[PDB]
Symmetry: D2
Subunit: 343 residues, 4 copies
């Protein structure tokens, strides 16, 4: 029977939020990193993980100039970051909303190894998720993020892990859209190992087809949904160099064969590549003549912050240089999402 | 492992053929009909079904003037129609190829009831089909057609029937593309009964999602594929009249949420509706203010040839006259494909 | 490739534990009541919900004479009951192990309604479950229990809910077997509403087929699992009464068409049945002259502990009468699980 | 809703037929030979493939003595053999019926390579099968046969081929049961290549689980079906040789974890192994102490006729020696079916 999944007011609200997030010239600042994960970046400088250090890093990232206001349409934060404040008497969500961006959140809870598989893993965080998402929404959160890590080996991935991750993302999106939060789905494939482009493209098509079949199964309202797939690049140890245009055509082909046009927008993740390479790769993505009926934007955590963290270096006086270089990189990526980036 | 479904050269060949079939301003003339099925249309006039009568009907539909040349990009015929000849020393495939259109064939073999259902059907003709498609290809047919009839009751279609039909269509498309023939997939939902628009839209989304999941499963090369879905219309007994714009938006919403942009084109059929209603409905389809990354085109057998057959009336002296009314309506369709039809 | 799911010694240990739990001449005592579920049972007497009342009730059930020692092969508890102790300062798991039974835990976390589906719910409790199961294992629990509730209406259950619950059970069993805990699976179909025996039998076959397909998908080691299905009975308000032999043959037919013989044992649940009715029904189950290769046993909650609950009545001087009636019911059920139950 | 797949009377008829075919001590004589298979077997002697030679071969096999009456409960024949007759004015169906056996038929139509797969194949013959099965049933046949070939390699079989074959077999069984014909499902895995026993066991479990899930999907009445799986043996060029008891344990484990007890009986196929080895392997399979609730029986075409074929020598005068050797091996296999064979 025809059973509705969302009342029309919810459809309109989610569509408006998703359009505001992936509006042209905008993007996602993936500043969210777990209290343990960001410790690696903090010690990369030569320092140690500290609560005030993390808060000041996120303050540096989220207190930039007007130059990035029409360039960062969404910022994703952690659970503890949402309950913090900056040196202005305002919390971080208030600053993000004032700057024009949309406050995000990472509602994942890490990965866990599976049984009877080589290196397949599944993510957790679905239990008690409706109340958590309601709490996030009442504190101010219009879109969440859930990621699944999938690795390509000599016989990986199996259909079991792919379907498991698809079901997990379907349930995640269902809960988020019921609570009133735009779900971001990231079937990320690790660009690690030694393989060519065709294998990665084929795996990406399979994963995207399974994910969208699962989404259609769970009565997901695809119009209020954002997609964050990987980029079609070879393995890290691959020696066969591929041109940027080949990467662009392979990626647009992979997205065109599986993703329905009703998806509001398709962001991207760097995947172990330098900032210049990722930015020019997405610029090539936005330079393909094929029909792309969805807004293509960027979402980089490590590609927009490595320069910022090395310039900041743990000192409270190098704030401006790190902010300036981060703004320069953000401007480069904002020009990259329209095909207007030249080196 | 990555296994190539098709070689690149035949990928380009099927892509070119599919682009030529659904080229802008063109169309599909569903001149195909079973030798037994055409008997009903012939006796509707009040005349005796005869082989010469069938051949002359096909001739009349397939010997029109230049006014329909940039309007019929493809004509579908039956098994015997290819082995026929016209009154000028030219077979029907030769006439169609010279006129500009592409010869099509119907490789279905009727339906058969299932077991333990509320009434469901699946089509046959998959076995011993590679050699038949090769024969049709060297006869002069560059694309085929397969249809699946699905009916909406109170709990139909079930998952079993939908998945079985999707598998049948996937095998059909795989065989056709292996032999070098562009497959046309027709998940026909019958507009019969008493139901509203939302139920038909939901069923259409489910069916298209299952069909495209099956196609991705069978390594189908979607770029060389044509889709022929139904129209989102209520049953003939429905007492709630819906405006044309509502039908257009519902249909474009159904097609946008499931069909990837890589599909070369999406045709349509009328079923139980008059010629003017279907033509203005497709005009509304092409006048909807939403982005559609595929060429929308028409394909009507009964909603475009009824006037021609009634004007012919079983008499050989109305040849041109029956053609004229056939031409004019076709021109209307050539105007509906671009949204330029105003009755 | 052929990736192992469990080391051989783990397989042997799980097989031994599962055989011990469901060995002939044993049973399962379902005390899997949290501090909230037991509140309704406690107030049904006319008293108040108290922690000491809960502990004394579970002491009354779990401290009994030898008459029930070869009758209860397993007692299921909740999180707090493991960390409790009797009057003589001995923990409940120690008492259960001394009496000969096997300690079990309920690792569910309630239900949550789904989106866009009528009257369907899915259970939670999978997140962070490996560490919780390890804690339960080193506490003294050797087998867990998971329940998924499914109701029967007009279009229920849908394929979505059935597959979702099957995947949840598969992940549950995978985690439990990886940690070293025998999983008990309860796809419980509510005998509520207005329907006949055939519909319930058909739904039960579908649910069990989906569950075992999911279990085979997740590399589950079926020899170390316990199945706790419903009993094939009509709805609560059915207009036609069925004989006990018909219920027995329907249940054994449903179990024989889906359950592989490698399943260690199949228990049951009351589903709104009195003590005498449930006892004679399971006696009929074991009286059906069909080849059943799995050990059939009982697992009763309210159908076996209601008389003891009312006899205890909240007073501490009625311990012996409630104990005697509970022992009588346990003896009746232990005689019923062999076909030798004399009314 | 609950829609019946078969009426109760024909349910009883199919159950009786299936029980008669797999009755204890009986067996299946695979006397079907394709025009290429029989060509190879007759050229093994060196004689010319002739219609009279084929008819005399089948007459030799199907008319031996009363000593095979309690040993051969079913004979599978080719399409042409059903319309044949012996030299005594009596057709083969009547001879088989009088002798006590049941006449079979092979309703397959060969294999066809798939697209985008290493070495996967799917069988054809489903189109126009209701009428063919009705003709076969009215001719005298009571149970059909369908052989599926699956190969084990580095990544084979894929899930696509497994699901394809499962759906093909489900449709086959549904059609046969609707026409009143007991289907025999043979998910045969080729014992060719180089692999160990565990991989073959794992593949067999996967294939059997998928096949029975498909059968449950298509409303198949499992009580009127027979199963003919591939005996769990390593590859042809396996480096490590395994004991017969290990083979029997692996086979009973594979069949017990997937096959519901409602299956009437499970036969077996030789699979490129010597005749004495096949006989002793089936004896060991019947020597396993594990509880098997289905009747195990033999079905060999090459293993029961190679000695008879070579003794016949393509001569009219060497009839009796070949007949005696064939009846001796029939007696040996009948003894092995009950676990009572000792060389």
């Amino acid at each position: 029977h025809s059973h509705p999944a969302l009342t029309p007011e919810q459809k309109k609200e989610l569509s408006d939020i998703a359009h505001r997030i992936v509006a042209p010239g905008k993007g996602i600042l993936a500043a969210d990193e777990s209290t343990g994960s960001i410790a690696k970046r903090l010690q990369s400088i030569g320092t140690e993980n500290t609560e005030e250090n993390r808060r000041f890093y996120r303050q540096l990232l989220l207190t930039a100039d007007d130059r990035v206001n029409p360039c960062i349409g969404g910022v994703i934060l952690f659970h503890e970051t949402l309950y913090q404040k900056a040196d202005d008497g305002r919390p971080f969500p208030q600053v993000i909303k004032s700057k024009g961006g949309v406050v995000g959140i990472k509602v994942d809870k890490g990965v866990v190894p599976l049984a009877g598989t080589n290196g397949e893993t599944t993510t957790q965080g679905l239990d008690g998720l409706s109340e958590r998402c309601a709490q996030y929404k009442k504190d101010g959160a219009d879109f969440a993020k859930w990621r699944c890590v999938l690795k390509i080996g000599e016989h990986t991935p199996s259909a079991l892990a792919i379907m498991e991750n698809a079901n997990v993302l379907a349930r995640y999106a269902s809960i988020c859209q019921q609570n009133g939060i735009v779900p971001i789905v990231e079937p990320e494939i690790l660009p690690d190992g030694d393989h060519d482009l065709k294998r990665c493209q084929y795996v990406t098509e399979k994963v995207l087809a399974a994910v969208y079949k699962a989404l259609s199964d769970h009565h997901i309202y695809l119009e209020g949904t954002l997609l964050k797939p990987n980029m079609v690049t070879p393995g890290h140890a691959c020696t066969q160099k591929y041109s940027h245009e080949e990467i662009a055509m392979a990626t647009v082909t992979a997205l065109r064969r599986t993703v329905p046009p009703a998806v509001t927008g398709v962001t991207f993740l760097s995947g172990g590549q330098s900032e210049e390479e990722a930015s020019i790769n997405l610029n090539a993505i936005n330079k393909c003549p094929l029909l792309k009926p969805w807004a293509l934007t960027f979402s980089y955590g490590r590609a927009l912050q490595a320069s910022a963290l090395k310039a900041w270096g743990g000192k409270k006086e190098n704030l401006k240089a790190a902010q300036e270089e981060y703004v320069k990189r953000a401007l480069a990526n904002s020009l990259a999402c329209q095909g207007k980036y030249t080196p």
